[PDB]
Every structure is written in C-alpha cells, then in structure tokens.
From a paper:
The initial structural studies revealed [name] requires tightly, non-covalently bound nicotinamide adenine dinucleotide (NAD+) co-factor for catalytic activity and also established the enzyme as part of the short chain dehydrogenase/reductase (SDR) superfamily. Such proteins are characterized by a conserved Y-X-X-X-K catalytic motif and a signature G-X-X-X-G-X-G motif for co-factor binding. As outlined, AnGALE was able to interconvert between [name]-Glcp and [name]-Galp in vitro resulting in a 75:25 ([name]-Glcp:[name]-Galp) mixture regardless of which substrate was employed (reverse reaction not shown). The overall activity profile for wild-type AnGALE towards [name]-Glcp/[name]-Galp and [name]-GlcpNAc/[name]-GalpNAc interconversion more closely resembles that of EcGALE.
To this end, we have determined the ternary crystal structure of AnGALE complexed with NAD+ and [name]-Glcp. AnGALE was found to crystallize in the C2 space group with an asymmetric unit containing the characteristic homodimer previously reported in both the E. coli and Human forms, along with an additional monomer which also forms a dimer through symmetry. The three monomers are nearly identical with backbone root-mean-square deviation (r.m.s.d.) of 0.2, 0.4, and 0.2 Å between monomer A & B, monomer A & C, and monomer B & C, respectively. As can be seen, the structure folds into two domains consisting of an N-terminal motif (M1 - A201, red) and C-terminal motif (G202 - K371, blue). The NAD+ is anchored within this domain directly atop the β-sheet forming one half of the active site which exists in the cleft between the domains. There are a total of 16 hydrogen bonds anchoring the cofactor within the N-terminal portion of the active site cleft. Examination of the structures reveals the models are remarkably similar, the major difference being that AnGALE has an elongated and slightly bent α6 helix along with an additional short α7 helix prior to β6 compared to HGALE. Focusing on the reaction center, Y156, postulated to be the active site base in the Human enzyme (Y157), forms a similar hydrogen bond to the substrate 4'-hydroxyl group (3.4 Å) previously observed in HGALE (3.2 Å). Also of importance to the reaction mechanism is the hydride transfer distance between C4 of the sugar and C4 of the nicotinamide ring which was found to be 3.5 Å in both enzymes.
Residue numbers in the entry:
A (entry chain A), B (entry chain A): 2 to 365
The structure:
Amino acid sequence: PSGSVLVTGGTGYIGSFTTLALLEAGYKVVVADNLYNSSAEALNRIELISGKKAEFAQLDVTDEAAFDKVFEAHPDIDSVIHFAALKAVGESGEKPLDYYHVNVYGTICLLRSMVRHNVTNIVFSSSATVYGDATRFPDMIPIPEHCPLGPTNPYGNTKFAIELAITDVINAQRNNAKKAGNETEAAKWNGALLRYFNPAGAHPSGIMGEDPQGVPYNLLPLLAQVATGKREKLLVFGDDYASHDGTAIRDYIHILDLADGHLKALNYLRANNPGVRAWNLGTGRGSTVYEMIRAFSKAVGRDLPYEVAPRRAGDVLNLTSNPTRANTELGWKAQRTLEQACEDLWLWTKNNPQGYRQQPPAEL
Amino acid sequence: PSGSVLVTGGTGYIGSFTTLALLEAGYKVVVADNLYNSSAEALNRIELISGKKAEFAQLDVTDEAAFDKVFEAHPDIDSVIHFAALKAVGESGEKPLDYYHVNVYGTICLLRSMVRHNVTNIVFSSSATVYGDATRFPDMIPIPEHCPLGPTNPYGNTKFAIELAITDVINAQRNNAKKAGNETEAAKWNGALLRYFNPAGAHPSGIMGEDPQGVPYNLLPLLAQVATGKREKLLVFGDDYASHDGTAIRDYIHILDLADGHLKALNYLRANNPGVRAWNLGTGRGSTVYEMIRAFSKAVGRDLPYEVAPRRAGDVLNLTSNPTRANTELGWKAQRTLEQACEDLWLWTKNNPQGYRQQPPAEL
Ligand SMILES: NC(=O)c1ccc[n+]([C@@H]2O[C@H](COP(=O)([O-])OP(=O)(O)OC[C@H]3O[C@@H](n4cnc5c(N)ncnc54)[C@H](O)[C@@H]3O)[C@@H](O)[C@H]2O)c1
Ligand SMILES: NC(=O)c1ccc[n+]([C@@H]2O[C@H](COP(=O)([O-])OP(=O)(O)OC[C@H]3O[C@@H](n4cnc5c(N)ncnc54)[C@H](O)[C@@H]3O)[C@@H](O)[C@H]2O)c1
Ligand SMILES: O=c1ccn([C@@H]2O[C@H](COP(=O)(O)OP(=O)(O)O[C@H]3O[C@H](CO)[C@@H](O)[C@H](O)[C@H]3O)[C@@H](O)[C@H]2O)c(=O)[nH]1
Ligand SMILES: O=c1ccn([C@@H]2O[C@H](COP(=O)(O)OP(=O)(O)O[C@H]3O[C@H](CO)[C@@H](O)[C@H](O)[C@H]3O)[C@@H](O)[C@H]2O)c(=O)[nH]1
C-alpha cells in the first residue's frame, strides 16, 4: 500500500470523491461517518469505479471512544482527512450549538484520539466563509490566504475556531519535541488547512454524485431540480450587486479537482513537513449567478426559468479565489472547467433523479 | 432573594470574590467547581465575612449531565457566571487540547444545558489576551473594546472561540423568537463578555485571597513568595522594552473592583437587555514591572531583590485598558487603587503564608 488514511465523512459529497481518489492512488482508506447527511451506497459506487473498496466504520464524530476503536484496529493509519461537519449556513444561525458540538468538539475528540494513538497528519476541510466579506479591504480580491479572517455566520466561526485549534495542537507537538531535543518526532506532526470555495459537478461516469438528506439549498443542486421537474423555477437572490449583470460572484470548482487537491496536500505534508499551512482550493475564475444558470441550461439543452428575489442575508459580493499558492507549492491546478462541471452534473441528475436510493441505468 | 445565580469556578480566585459580592447583594449563589485549582475552604471564609453561604456543587464543567442536575434542583437560577477554565498561558502552549476541552467544550456543555433548562443570562470571563499585541495598530493604546481581536497563544484562542460561540448562541435565541413574533422571549437572552486584565490583591480582612494548586507564575504572587521567604528573588523578564524604565506595561486592577464589575454587568443585562456586549475591566492606569516591585516592596517594608532576565516569549509591550465604555454604560469604576491592592495582598500573604490549608490568626 502507498499509505493508510482515515477519512471522516467519507460517504459525503466531497468525502466520496476524495476517498475515490485515495484508493485509486493506492491508499488504504477507512471511512468514518454516522450517515447523517449521506448514504453508505456511495462506497459501493466507488468499488464499481475504482475496483477497490474502503473499510467503513459507522460512528459519531463526537464519540471519542469510537475514534479510539478505529486507531486500535488500524494502528497503521498515521494520517486523517477531516470532512465530518455541518455545512448549512442559514441553519447555523438557527441552531449554532449543534454546529459547535459537531464541528468544533468533534474535531477536539479527533485530535485527542490522534495524539493518543500517534497519528500525526491531519487535513482539515475549511471553508472560504472564514474570509467573510473581502470588500472591506483594498486589493484583497481575488482572496489570498494571508487575508485576515472574519466570518459572518456561526458556521464560519466553527471553521475559524478549528483552524486555530489545529495550529495550536500541532505546533505544540512539534515544539515539545524540539524542547526535548527530538527534531525527528517534531517533523512528523503536520496539518493542512484546505479552504474550499464552491464545489460543483459529479463523476463523468454518472454513477456517483451528491445525494444528501433533507432539502437542497445550493445553487447547482437547485438548478438540477428545476431541470428535472421537482422545482418550478429558481429564485435569484438579488440583482443589484456590483457586478456587470447584477448578480453575486463565486468561484465554482469541479469536485474532481477539489478532491485531487487533498492528494497534493497530503504529499506536501509527508514531504516538506512544514507543520501547519493553509491553501485555497479554487480556480481563480469569478462567475455570476446569471452565468451559472446559463452554463447549466446549456448543459441540459433548454433555458431554465428563474425569478428575481431580494438579497439573501449574509451573502457577500465576491468570493473569487487566489490559488497561486496552491499552484506553486502543492503543484495543484484546476484541470476541469466550469462548463465541464455542469455537463457531468446534469449527467448524474438526469440518469439518477433520486440519488442513491435507486439503481443506476445500464452503464457498461 | 434578589435573584439566583450559578457560578462556575466560584471557589477560584476571581470566582470567590464574585460570589462574595453576590451574596452581599442579596443573591442566591450555587457554586460549581471540580476543585482543580482551588479549595472549598474559600466558601467557609465567605460565610465568616458576609454571614451568608453559597450552595456548593462539585462537578466537572465538561460533564453536561452534571449541569442538568443543578438546573433541575434549582429551576430558579435564570443566570450563570462562567469562571471555570484553565488560565496558564505558557502551559497552554504545552497542552492546548486540555484547554480546548475545558474552556471551549466546557462552555458548550453549559450553553446546551442552559438552553435546555431556559436559563437565559450568561456572564463570561474573557481575558485581555484576545487583543494580542495592540502596537500593530495606530492609536489603539489604551485598548478599546472595538479593537480587532488576535490572540498569540492557545489560551487566548480558547477565550476568543468562546466569545464567538456566546454571540452566535444567544443571538440565535433572540432571532428565533423574533421570527416567531415573540419579542418578549427574545429580550430574555443576554450575554456579558467581560474582558479582564490583570487582577491583584485580596480581601482587606486578610482571611480570604488567592490559594491555587501547583507553582505560581504571575507577578504579584511571586513577589509575595520573595517577601515571605519561599523565593530567593524575582526574575524580571526583559529590561529593553519601549517604556521609560525598560520594563513591560500592564493594567493592574483590584480584585474587589473586578468582582464588583460583574454585579454592574448582571444588572445591565436584566435592565436594558442589549443581548451580547463586551466590556473591559481595567483601571486605565499603565504600570511597569519596576513600579510594581517598588509598590509591593513599600507595602511590605523592605525592598525585594530582583535580577534581570531576557524577554519572555509572547509578552506584549502594553496592555493598558480603555474602560470608558464600562464607566458610562455599566456605571462601574475602579474604586480601589494599585497601591491599595499591594497592602491587602501582603496582609493576606503575611498572615496566611500557606493559603487555605491553614487556619488564620485570631481575627475579631
Ligand atoms: N459543500 C460546500 O459548498 C462546502 C464548501 C466549503 C467547505 N465545505 C466543508 O467540506 C466538508 C464536507 O462537505 P460536503 O459538501 O462533503 O458535505 P456532506 O454533508 O456531504 O459531508 C459531510 C459528512 O459529515 C457527516 N457527519 C456529519 N455529522 C457527523 C457526525 N456527528 N459524525 C460522523 N459523521 C458526521 C455526514 O454524514 C456527511 O457524510 C464539510 O466540513 C463542509 O463544511 C463544504
Ligand atoms: N487570573 C488572571 O490574570 C485572569 C485574567 C483574565 C481572565 N481570567 C479568567 O478568569 C477566570 C478565573 O480566573 P481565576 O484567576 O479566578 O483562576 P482560578 O484557577 O482561581 O479559577 C478557575 C476555577 O476553575 C475551576 N475549574 C477548572 N477546570 C474545571 C473543570 N473542568 N470543572 C469545574 N471547575 C473547573 C478551578 O477549580 C478554579 O476554581 C478564568 O476563566 C480565567 O481564564 C483570569
Ligand atoms: O436559490 C438560490 C441559491 C443561491 N443563489 C446565489 O448563488 C450563489 C451561490 O449560492 P450557494 O451555492 O448557496 O453558495 P454560497 O452562498 O456561496 O455558500 C455555499 O458555499 C460555501 C463555500 O464556503 C459553503 O461553506 C456553504 O456551506 C454553502 O452554503 C450566491 O451568490 C447566492 O446568492 C441564488 O441566487 N439562488
Ligand atoms: O516573574 C515574573 C513574572 C512576570 N513578569 C512580568 O510581569 C508582567 C505581568 O506578568 P503576569 O502576571 O504573568 O501577567 P501577564 O503575562 O500579563 O498575563 C497574566 O494575565 C492575563 C490577563 O489577560 C491572564 O489571561 C493570564 O492567564 C496571566 O498569565 C509581564 O510584563 C511579565 O513579563 C516578570 O517580569 N517576572
């Protein structure tokens, strides 16, 4: 094997494609999830694509004893990728305690169990919401990693709190080893703070994609529901923004390039051993809402109906990425394009309108 | 009774004088502590001074079920003052996980139990370390509340993370009530973020003071050990600072004024109901290390011996407070002075060289 990796979440959206890329790289993957917002079927789809399958452990991330059982059964893990969290921004303003309990405390349980079993590498799933609004700063768009952090929602604060925790915990392990004159043990402890932006698309085979629980709230999944008949139309949130057409700007990156960025980051940790460092995982291409509706409509064939609604509270003007650091240091670049994401997203939705609770059509 | 209050910590340094001021105000106090860094004897000293005694509950703050038992036995609490935490800055760089588990997660358990039992007011014990170094900002000294936060140690990050949690949790309770057209229920939820600076001194009766576990590390307690014979001398950390004599600057506030600030804040919450707001609890008077050694030496009689050592890592130049907000809004001002603190501190140490594990001399 080319190494072992524990993947919390794993059965989730970004988690599934990440474990897929890991197995195809030759890694041994153990997936940890309580299946709150995903299905275990995603693993079966991985086996059909890669030929390899990951071991599955069903446990709550807030259960510290459960993390111990995993490391005791797999003492060769050495590195963990952390996806397990709650990601609904609006919901975080309704019940932030559940977010602080799952995201923050869940990470605490992980780190404690990590130190206890001597797994020294962690790759955290941070968001771009930690930057908040970047228009209050001159020449801060596109957004670099050295941008001062300041979230505007409880979800962002959880991610921001974890980043501070990851830095402190890991640096302590390194500094305590340096004090004891053990530079060897110090170099082993590393952390990758990957700040995702806006993910989109699915697998080109059309057998794997995003299948969450509850009602979708993101732009593309809602557009997919319009094009499939579940939704009547789309509600554009604000048309008076400082863009050219009037809609907000985001950085939409393909899920395949997003998941591949973990492989680059994990290698950079096992190589240089820089300790803790953050990286933006975007494309650098800013796209308006109107452009996305048009891009996805072109992928489907017909133009999807929409209606203009007032601005959504907490929505920033621009969230374009400055991925120059990730391109040079990690050697990672967004291969797939924005339009290329709409094509295999629509491929996934058209063939699988009911996600994983159905069996895909005759594919190969 | 003039209200009921749960006081986590309570048996600790700032906690003891706070519960003392609460009982003297007519409040009903239930003290929660695991006695990690304090003794239960402090309560007996309170009974001797105030005549009233607080109910004691021995429990870990990371035990959510224990918090439930308290609220179920005391359904009339309605408000909680949160002191329970780990405060050693240097130690936080050695084992930050224990700090994130006790400070951050302990607060999470409290809030969850608070929402569960409908106690709506919380007064958090924040530190001035959340400001970090304020010299990187023009005209930011003395330090106002609107200073952008940026800690330099894991201990500061825990306090900073909690502040964000307190804001999000409480604002959610208010906003959810507003959405349901219930402005009455929304006004009940409030939070006071009291950012302490540098506490000093003890009770003028000399029967109550600071008696922690382990070895002291703060300036005044170490000076007290020199003047009592336990220490040989004091080690001044750096004499090349940008002050007039060369030593660092801090804001030393008497523990009695510090504890009384909670009464003012608690009243401001039950009155205006502003939701969440931060207040600095200092004097505005900046004092160097040399001035403190001289001030305490004068309180003892003889001049204490000291030796100059290089700078301590993470020590900022200035930490003077800008308490103008606390003076106007809360109607709180530091009555006692700096020199007045050294006098009753030395009174406490001279008569009680072994803290609470001894019986005080014949006092009244
Ligand atoms: N989707 C986005 O636009 C976005 C953007 C930036 C960052 N992220 C972050 O990336 C990560 C993954 O996002 P995603 O889109 O893959 O979402 P997702 O919901 O598909 O993945 C999250 C996974 O966490 C699991 N989980 C939640 N609580 C758990 C618990 N207590 N115990 C065990 N498992 C638990 C869920 O079952 C799910 O599989 C999250 O941390 C999210 O905040 C996502
Ligand atoms: N001392 C300072 O210079 C300073 C300055 C700024 C802020 N503060 C903050 O003020 C608060 C009180 O400080 P203090 O000087 O009174 O220190 P302290 O040690 O006397 O008080 C802390 C109390 O917390 C208790 N405690 C710790 N962990 C616990 C747990 N898991 N369960 C139950 N109880 C637990 C201890 O037993 C102790 O009584 C702390 O939050 C501290 O960070 C102190
Ligand atoms: O029905 C809709 C949905 C969205 N939008 C707009 O489309 C853009 C993108 O919306 P969405 O997909 O919800 O993304 P963001 O609001 O940018 O935030 C998402 O992407 C973040 C990246 O950091 C994640 O952390 C969050 O969990 C996730 O809600 C925004 O400008 C919205 O105003 C609409 O106009 N109409
Ligand atoms: O032996 C000593 C101890 C201290 N100092 C100096 O005295 C000053 C005050 O030291 P100390 O009492 O340790 O206070 P701070 O370093 O300012 O921090 C304390 O006060 C904070 C207020 O926010 C709390 O949060 C921390 O827990 C606590 O360590 C500093 O300039 C030190 O460099 C010395 O020169 N020699």
